[PDB]
Design a protein around this ligand. Structure first.
Ligand SMILES: Fc1ccc2[nH]c(CNc3nc(N4CCOCC4)nc4c3ncn4-c3ccc4ccccc4c3)nc2c1F
Ligand code: NA
Ligand code: NA
Lengths: 293, 293
């Protein structure tokens, strides 16, 4: 129970984000439902205001949620954001945990572009997973958004574009299921890692699971190591057996990138667009969830 | 002449037999409220209603836990007044001709795992997991599964330090044989794993209509329990669960594999069934079989 900024009513908690939990809220005068991220104001490692500045800078990008307000109330720093629709994990569930090839390809085009946009503004996301992509609402119902800059990092200097240096012995940031192999091996993340993670997300939608899910281990730290080991020991063409070759081509391209390379985002989009064309699918933007009755 | 305990509580019919005392429908005349009332004979050699009331009190505020009020002795009974709930899952199973649909089983499973997890989070094991001890709410709480009856419950870890109780052997079987874990039949101290194994048998009971170790007749309770034990031990999980989704066997195997002092992965177990629920095309609408009769 809180009122933020003389303007917003705080509603229920709906999930967690990076360094802050996510709540529904209401702009009381406008009657507009919003999403609200909260950070304990006494935290040793404050970052919500850093995140807010990244959002302000990213504003105007297609599929970046709008930031409505950032401030403080009571015991919290507060960031009020545009309300979006369900996540891609939610929609995957609503689609019986199967997506058509067409839907996978429609999603892939947008997800690559969203990652490219973030990179163009000098950041890497570092938390690419199905729960961080949400569909828009209303006139934006066909648009895939990416959320959460709480794990984002600047990878190149804004004035000179000098890339960050190569580093080793680093910690994993996001969900281990989708981490790149180099992230598991302790290498500093860069643009290639966001795109490799996306490749695992796409094959997760194709398969329903990844082969490194559900592994036994004594501890969380050891579980991550076993996930790493299974990823390293599963050839891409085994992972992607029976699916269009483009999914393997995509993953091998990402794994081939140098630390500081600029990815060829166009190439990666074109793989999937050419497959979409060869398959004869309609250019109607109809996703699988648009068929639900 | 109608029964009234103290001046305040009018007893109606018996609605269940609890582990150490029976539960009656009743009226709190002073409050003007329909309630449930548990009575324990004050001359019992092993008084425990007050103990049970304390466990309920400590559980208070948990989702799906009834509220209670301890009322001490009245004449030659100890009295505990309880929030009145709706029908038990056994009662509903009978109403539904002793078979539930897969969707209903999976709706129930999600909540039952969560109720057990909650009890474990408050440092107790239930030790009598059975359909008679899960009740639906009344009215607007009709979609909520509650758990009742702490008469056999035991603290399994220290509330502060989480030190677990020690392993013990040669324990008598005091709960319900039909749903007892294999280790319980073998005299082993119960722990969190046993509550979850029992729940696995409850789910397969709802799927099948009966378990293969029901109806085994014998002269004595020890002989009957031995026949049940032997049938459980000698029926492979994959035979028990033949013709049902693999998740039911995966669940039971997971529970049987846990160490005595292991913390179960309750999230994994809920996700196992939620993924199945979605693959089957069901919606979380809380429309149970008894709603569509
Ligand atoms: F009870 C529930 C359960 C799930 C629901 N999903 C939705 C769909 N809307 C949004 N959901 C989320 N969730 C993130 C945390 O896990 C839950 C989903 N973030 C949003 C949303 N709309 C905007 N954001 C949003 C916008 C900007 C962000 C910026 C940083 C971090 C998180 C951010 C989140 N409503 C739900 C609901 F009512
Ligand atoms: Na990544
Ligand atoms: Na219902």
């Amino acid at each position: 129970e809180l009122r933020v900024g003389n303007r917003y009513r705080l509603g229920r908690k709906i999930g967690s984000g990076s360094f802050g939990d996510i709540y529904l809220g209401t702009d009381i005068a406008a009657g507009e439902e919003v999403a609200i991220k909260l950070e304990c104001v006494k935290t040793k490692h404050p970052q919500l205001h850093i995140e807010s500045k990244i959002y302000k800078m990213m504003q105007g990008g297609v599929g970046i949620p709008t930031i409505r307000w950032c401030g403080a109330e009571g015991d919290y720093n507060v960031m009020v954001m545009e309300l979006l629709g369900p996540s891609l994990e939610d929609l995957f569930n609503f689609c019986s945990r199967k997506f058509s090839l067409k839907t996978v390809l429609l999603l892939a085009d947008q997800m690559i572009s969203r990652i490219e946009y973030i990179h163009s503004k000098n950041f890497i996301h570092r938390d690419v997973k199905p729960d961080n992509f949400l569909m828009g609402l209303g006139k934006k119902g066909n648009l895939v958004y990416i959320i959460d800059f709480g794990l984002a990092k600047k990878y190149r200097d804004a004035r000179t574009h000098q890339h960050i240096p190569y580093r080793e012995n680093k910690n994993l940031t996001g969900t281990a299921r989708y981490a790149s192999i180099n992230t598991h091996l302790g290498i500093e993340q860069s643009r290639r890692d966001d795109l490799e993670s996306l490749g695992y997300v796409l094959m997760y939608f194709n398969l329903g699971s990844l082969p490194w899910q559900g592994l036994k281990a004594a501890t969380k730290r050891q579980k991550y190591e076993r996930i790493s080991e299974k990823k390293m020991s599963t050839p891409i063409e085994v992972l992607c057996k029976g699916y269009p070759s483009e999914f393997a081509t995509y993953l091998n391209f990402c794994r081939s990138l140098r630390f500081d390379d600029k990815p060829d985002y166009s190439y990666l989009r074109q793989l999937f667009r050419n497959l979409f064309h060869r398959q004869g699918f309609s250019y109607d933007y109809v996703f699988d969830w648009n068929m639900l009755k």
